[PDB]
């Protein structure tokens, strides 16, 4: 009883001060490190916001920042869910496509070739 179903776009009610409209979100899956050859940081979406101004503090030596919303990393299972959450918050998003590793047929038999020039020299 009493449903009152209304279809409309999501809006921010519990929102902070004027900083959401200026800052742009970059919902992109984190790339694997150059040295570490393991895929575990990948296959999970991360919504990291663009970094603002940073300067060395006159108090000591640390680099203090005025920008509050900067040091947060969110997790998402689907690309459609991350895009819907960004619209729900209010901030404009620039989504990047996931770069999947291409399947390359790396066979051991190619190392000892006769006709082909793909023969491995000195082991």
């Amino acid at each position: 009883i009493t449903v009152d179903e209304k279809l409309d776009i999501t809006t921010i009610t519990g929102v902070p001060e004027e900083h959401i409209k200026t800052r742009k979100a970059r919902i992109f899956v984190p790339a694997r490190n150059n040295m570490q050859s393991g895929v575990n940081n990948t296959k999970k979406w991360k919504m990291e916001f663009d970094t603002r101004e940073r300067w060395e503090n006159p108090l000591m030596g640390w680099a203090s920042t005025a920008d509050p919303l900067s040091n947060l990393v969110l997790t998402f299972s689907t690309k459609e869910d991350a895009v819907a959450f960004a619209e729900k918050n209010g901030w404009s998003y620039d989504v990047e496509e996931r770069k999947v590793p291409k399947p390359k047929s790396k066979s051991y038999g190619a190392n000892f070739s006769w006709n082909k020039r793909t023969r491995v020299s000195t082991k």
Binding site: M35, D50, K104, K106
Partner: protein
């Protein structure tokens, strides 16, 4: 239709015949611990860590070696597979020094992450530990061979992809040293990738050395400038300072490697850069002034002069947001006469049509080529990533490559067809050493370098490529969707300027001298005191000012590639968006904000409020630079070839020789890497 059904822990998976055990496990989501195997490199069963037991077999086989046949139940979490991984890990760390505090690699280390998860908690080890004498390989790569696990991955890297052949195994048993026997100073292209190839802390960056640990620095994705290919590399920042730049895996940008000149030269942006706006004082020397006062002195001349007597010469480290703003400040306020620093032909519809401006064939499309007929250019000096792609296309598949126009050192074979512009004219007709191979080919491609194009014979080299490409592809060569002619621009901004609507070359400034020139990031020798025959009033706007900065009246500081967040065009024709990693030093501002504030100080104000407003205006001028990381091929190549052939020009007598034709030549170039502590140390040791 060439598919085999096999079981990983009892779960069904369909695989192509010829694929390895590890390749089949990647399909379901499993990842077997590895040390030798790499996605780009070849296969070797050296370490024997990727052991995985398949049922009904007495011996455990490696994931590297075995190709998957019909009917295998690969057990990853059996009693023997766990004991195999725990066993070998104890052998790997028995003769490996306790160096984790003094090691340059921290959390990124492959031995650390794997030994904690797969290896045993405690070691049986009591006495032993071998010690290896370290060999000084180069000033760019620090080498401590004590920590090396003799995995044989760098040796394969230098032999198969880099093509230098210096590293090799010497000795037997424990006494085996990886490296060059003759103590030769190893310096070549792609040498800044061998630090990332090595899984352990044996090979590390000497300019970086010790600054931050992998977990401490926050990673940020950006497209690398000052390179033709435009490789993607995640720049790491440790509290408002760029510490290390490491490449990320990408299909379009060659491979999972960055250029040697791009990766090692991280300190170049931090050593010398303009911090405060400097205006020319009454005495003579440039002095630091307020931002409101320095802009007012620049706006006083800019608003006063009108017509064809105002022209901007920009090229080098220029962005797409800078290109859209400078064109809106020049063409709207006065008459448009904006020029590019890099010389490019525009006589026979050069700027018009996207097929003539940029390379038609994709950067990844070099692998699917029958024969590469390259023009007079050095691939080793200009774009090391593209030279690696051409070598990988030569190693994996049989494709005869020909490079005509001054012989130079290359990783591939040879097959040079002389060293003359007349030989290129003979190649268009029925040639004897060439043409016959070009006629009988599946998909031939001709790559014309910008190194020879920026000379006296600009139109002559362009007509030979259009006449040669038009007679080959349209007649019998191309059978469907295939590219014939390619142009790889040396400068980073040259590919972006031609697409936007800038006049290429310094000929526009040479024909009509301007009164006041606002040269945005002037690096090349185009504008000088002898070149301009009037009162200077030159405005220099760009990060790292060493050349061009002394010959300026009002210099405004700008942000570098790591500073400003704007799009950049690739050689293939792809717009890659760069993100801001660190704040600009001093009172320096962004490229899009610098031109908008100049218009606001003057009478005529440009329609721009934010970065989104500048992106919308850039989308209206060119739709190709609107979509990020999406490249589209240009149509009508035969129409462009007919328009270019109408112009008549005589061929030059001098051979098509590249300006950079040495191993030491590609160290200090394009002024951005010239003011560096790392690059100058490398260049001095290259000759000595």
């Amino acid at each position: 239709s060439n598919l085999i059904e096999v079981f990983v822990d009892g779960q069904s998976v369909m695989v192509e015949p010829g694929t390895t055990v590890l390749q089949a496990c990647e399909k379901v989501g499993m990842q077997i611990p590895r040390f030798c195997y790499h996605e780009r490199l070849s296969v070797a069963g050296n370490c024997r860590m990727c052991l995985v037991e398949i049922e009904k077999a007495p011996k455990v086989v490696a994931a590297c070696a075995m190709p998957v046949m019909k009917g295998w139940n690969i057990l990853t979490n059996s009693e023997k597979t766990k004991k195999a991984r725990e066993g070998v890990m104890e052998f790997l760390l028995a003769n490996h020094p306790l160096d984790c505090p003094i090691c340059d690699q921290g959390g990124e280390c492959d031995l650390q992450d794997q030994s904690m998860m797969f290896g045993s908690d405690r070691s049986r080890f009591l006495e032993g530990k071998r010690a290896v004498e370290d060999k000084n390989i180069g000033p760019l790569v620090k080498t401590i061979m004590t920590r090396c696990i003799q995995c044989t991955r760098c040796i394969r890297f230098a032999s198969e992809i880099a093509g230098v052949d210096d590293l090799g195994t010497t000795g037997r048993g424990n006494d085996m040293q990886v490296g060059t026997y003759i103590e030769k100073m190893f310096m070549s292209e792609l040498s800044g990738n061998i630090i990332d190839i090595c899984p352990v802390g044996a090979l590390t960056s000497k300019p970086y050395a010790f600054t931050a640990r992998p977990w401490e620095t926050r990673k940020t994705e950006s497209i690398d400038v000052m390179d033709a290919v435009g490789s993607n590399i995640v720049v790491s920042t440790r509290t408002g300072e760029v510490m290390r730049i490491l490449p990320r895996m990408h299909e379009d940008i060659n491979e999972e490697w960055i250029s040697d000149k791009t990766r090692f030269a991280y300190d170049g942006l931090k050593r010398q850069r303009l911090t405060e706006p400097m205006v020319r004082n009454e005495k003579g020397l440039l002095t630091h002034t307020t931002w409101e006062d320095a802009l007012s002195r620049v706006a006083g001349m800019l608003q006063s002069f009108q017509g064809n007597d105002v022209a901007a010469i920009a090229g080098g480290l220029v962005d797409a947001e800078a290109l859209i703003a400078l064109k809106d400040l020049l063409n709207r306020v006065d008459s448009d006469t904006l020029c590019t620093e890099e010389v490019f032909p525009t006589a026979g519809a050069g700027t018009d049509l996207r097929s003539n401006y940029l390379l038609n064939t994709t950067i990844a499309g070099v692998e699917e080529a029958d024969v590469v007929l390259l023009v007079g250019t050095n691939p080793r000096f200009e774009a090391p990533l593209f030279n690696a792609r051409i070598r990988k296309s030569w190693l994996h598949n049989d494709l005869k490559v020909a490079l005509i126009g001054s012989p130079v050192d290359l990783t591939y074979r040879y097959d040079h067809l002389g060293d003359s512009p007349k030989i290129l004219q003979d190649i268009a007709s029925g040639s004897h050493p060439f043409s016959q191979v070009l006629q009988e080919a599946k998909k031939p491609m001709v790559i014309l370098g910008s190194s020879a194009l920026q000379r006296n014979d600009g139109a002559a080299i362009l007509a030979a490529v259009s006449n040669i490409a038009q007679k080959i592809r349209t007649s019998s060569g191309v059978t469907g969707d295939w590219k014939v002619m390619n142009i790889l621009h040396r400068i980073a901004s040259q590919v972006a300027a031609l697409d936007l609507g800038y006049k290429p070359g310094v000929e526009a400034i040479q024909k009509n001298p301007p009164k006041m020139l606002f040269l945005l990031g002037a690096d090349g020798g185009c504008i000088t005191r002898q070149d301009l025959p009037k009162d200077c009033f030159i405005v220099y706007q760009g990060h790292h000012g060493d050349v061009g900065a002394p010959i300026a009246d009002v210099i405004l500081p700008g942000a570098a590639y790591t500073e400003k967040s704007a799009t950049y065009v690739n050689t293939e024709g792809r717009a890659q968006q760069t993100k801001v990693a660190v704040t600009p030093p001093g009172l320096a501002r962004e490229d899009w904000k610098i031109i908008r504030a100049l218009s606001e100080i003057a009478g005529m104000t440009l329609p721009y409020d934010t970065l989104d407003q500048v992106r919308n205006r850039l989308e209206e001028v060119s739709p190709n630079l609107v979509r990020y990381d999406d490249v589209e091929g240009a149509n009508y190549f035969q129409q462009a070839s007919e328009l270019s052939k109408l112009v008549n020009q005589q061929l030059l007598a001098d051979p098509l020789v590249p300006p950079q034709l040495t191993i030491k030549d590609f160290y200090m170039t394009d002024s951005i890497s010239r003011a560096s502590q790392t690059m100058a140390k490398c260049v001095k040791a290259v000759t000595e």
